[PDB]
Design a protein around this ligand. Structure first.
Ligand SMILES: *[C@@H]1O[C@H](CO)[C@@H](O[C@@H]2O[C@H](CO)[C@@H](O)[C@H](O)[C@H]2NC(C)=O)[C@H](O)[C@H]1NC(C)=O
Length: 305
């Protein structure tokens, strides 16, 4: 059948216009298009990661109540995905920050996650992602926040769902052993932790350029993370990756995924960045019918599922 347990795409829109909070749906942000998601499901994709903003989901304080309107729009997309049998990743796309300030309260963060996870606790196709790309924070705080999120999710009775944890330094695969070895200490009573890493192929790994360093830089940038997963008996998932519409990037993406698939005993899969209805001519857009990456990469990616 497939190279991985999971292979799919990010579905972007609800995290857009982050300078406008709460902002206005249809003006500053939008929710993903379930008809466009269905096209990717029909192509074989079975996981979709859906960014949102913490401040739009639970405004004012992390310990507060949900914004009903934003939660209902967001959960309609989540429930469409799981209703079709695919896994849906709930991603607070917040960089370890709440209203621009680094999160430093494990107890506040745990409460945020109990409030949110309580709304999905009976849906075993939901996956929780503690936060997108912690960075420029103390490593012990990042590990503690991941643990606080796990604690809040399980305490809320959401015990059947995988939890994607993310490291410091933008959770990059290529720097994982440099910054994030202390993430090994995370515990989960359900034993469903997956280490979510991101890997881009431009010079700074930021994923802002359609040019890759070389045709082999992808494989080179995931070797150490793979060794770490295998050495420590952990599982991983490449929750973001992309490359530009050129042969060097396509071969780099292929070589990276080939290596992950060769090591599928620890790599559970990968999800492209990104699809969604508001990307226009984005260098990495996986949105049908005409996204640049949909045109250039979809048939390459279908090799793996
Ligand atoms: C959601 O995605 C669907 C599928 O791509 C979009 O539907 C296309 O819409 C155009 C214009 O309305 C039609 O001419 C096509 O026939 C549709 N294609 C398919 C395969 O149904 C739809 O416009 C998107 N909705 C948004 C972006 O709000």
């Amino acid at each position: 059948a497939s190279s991985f347990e999971w292979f799919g795409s990010n579905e972007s829109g609800a995290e857009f216009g982050s300078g406008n909070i709460p902002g206005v749906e249809g003006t500053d942000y939008t929710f993903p298009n379930t008809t466009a998601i269905q096209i990717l499901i029909d192509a074989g994709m079975n996981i979709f990661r859906v960014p949102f903003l913490m401040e739009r989901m639970i405004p004012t304080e992390m310990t507060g109540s949900l914004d009903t309107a934003y939660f209902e729009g967001y959960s309609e997309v989540i429930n469409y995905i799981t209703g079709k049998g695919a896994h849906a990743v709930v991603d607070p796309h917040n960089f370890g920050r709440y209203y621009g300030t680094p999160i430093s309260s494990t107890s506040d963060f745990q409460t945020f996650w109990s409030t949110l996870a309580s709304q999905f606790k009976s849906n075993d196709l939901v996956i929780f992602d503690t936060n997108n790309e912690y960075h420029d924070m103390d490593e012990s705080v990042v590990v503690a926040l991941n643990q606080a999120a796990i604690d809040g999710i399980r305490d809320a009775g959401a015990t059947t769902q995988y939890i994607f944890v993310e490291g410091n330094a933008y959770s990059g695969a290529w720097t994982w052993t440099t910054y994030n070895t202390a993430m090994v200490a995370l515990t989960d009573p359900s034993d469903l932790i997956v280490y979510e890493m991101h890997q881009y192929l431009d010079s700074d790994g930021s994923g802002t350029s359609d040019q890759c360093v070389s045709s082999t830089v992808g494989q080179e940038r995931v070797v150490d993370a793979t060794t770490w997963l295998q050495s420590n008996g952990k599982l991983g998932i490449l929750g973001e990756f992309a490359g530009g519409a050129n042969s060097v990037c396509e071969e780099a993406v292929e070589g990276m995924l080939d290596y992950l698939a060769e090591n599928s005993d620890v790599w559970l899969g990968a999800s492209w960045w990104s699809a969604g209805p508001w990307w226009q001519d984005y260098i990495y857009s996986m949105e049908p019918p005409n996204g640049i990456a949909y045109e250039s990469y979809l048939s390459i990616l279908e090799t793996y599922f």
